[PDB]
Amino acid sequence: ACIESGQLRLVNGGGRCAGRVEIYHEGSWGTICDDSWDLSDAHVVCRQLGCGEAINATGSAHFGEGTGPIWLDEMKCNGKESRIWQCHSHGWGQQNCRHKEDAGVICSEFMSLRLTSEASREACAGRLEVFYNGAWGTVGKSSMSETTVGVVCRQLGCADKGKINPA
């Protein structure tokens, strides 16, 4: 009957499965240094969130900039650990990196959506695309409610209402 110690959040990504890595210790949230970080080091974090396996690992604060103090530095992990705490670390509060270089992960369950008709990757009047495991695909036309159309438009933001185009 305990809320357990420490929590792992993915921020600034647009989904729960993809985001800049932030770790909860004490009453503060901190980021992970990007050095000695690879997809093998990202298998554990993607597993603990339940999303699954990792498809990319980002460094040099490409995903974003973290203001919180760095908790862990220079992590080397097998990739089969249940939680990031079992992965090797230099030590708590051993901040040798900086907010200039930050670490993030991209799991497999993260998804995105867009409409593309022609000559324009973002165009709110075109075929629908879905993004799964770093791949682009469409959904079947069969058995789609007009309400489902409405949510599609609301998600991307072309209009409050949309109408199915058979063409």
Partner 1 sequence: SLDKAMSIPMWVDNVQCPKGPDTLWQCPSSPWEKRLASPSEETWITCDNKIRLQEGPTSCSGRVEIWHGGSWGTVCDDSWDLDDAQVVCQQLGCGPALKAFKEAEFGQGTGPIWLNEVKCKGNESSLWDCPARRWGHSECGHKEDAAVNCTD
Query: Residue numbers of the site for Ca ion (CB under 5 A)?
Result: 35-36, 41, 76, 96, 101
* DSSP state at residue 92: T
Interface with partner 1 in residues 99-158 (CB under 8 A)? 100
Residue 81 contacts partner 1 per CB under 8 A: no
Residue (of 62, 65, 76, 56) closest to 22 by Cα position:
65
Q: Which does 98 bind (CB under 5 to 8 A by kind): Ca ion, partner 1, none?
A: partner 1
Q: Which does 41 bind (CB under 5 to 8 A by kind): partner 1, Ca ion, none?
A: Ca ion
Locus of tokens 């900086």:
98
Residue (of 90, 106, 92, 94) closest to 13 by Cα position:
106
Residue 98 contacts partner 1 per CB under 8 A: yes
Please state the closest distance from residue 36 (CB atom) to partner 1, in A: 11
Please state the closest distance from residue 67 (CB atom) to Ca ion, in A: 18
Q: Return the residue of 56, 82, 86, 96 that touches partner 1, per CB under 8 A.
A: 96
Residue 76 contacts partner 1 per CB under 8 A: no
**In angstroms, rounded to a whole number, what is the distance separating the alpha carbons of residues 89 and 23?**
14
Handedness of CA 60, 63, 65, 66 (dihedral sign): negative
User: For residue 68, what are its two tokens?
Assistant: 């919180």
Binding site for partner 1 (CB under 8 A): 35, 96, 98, 100
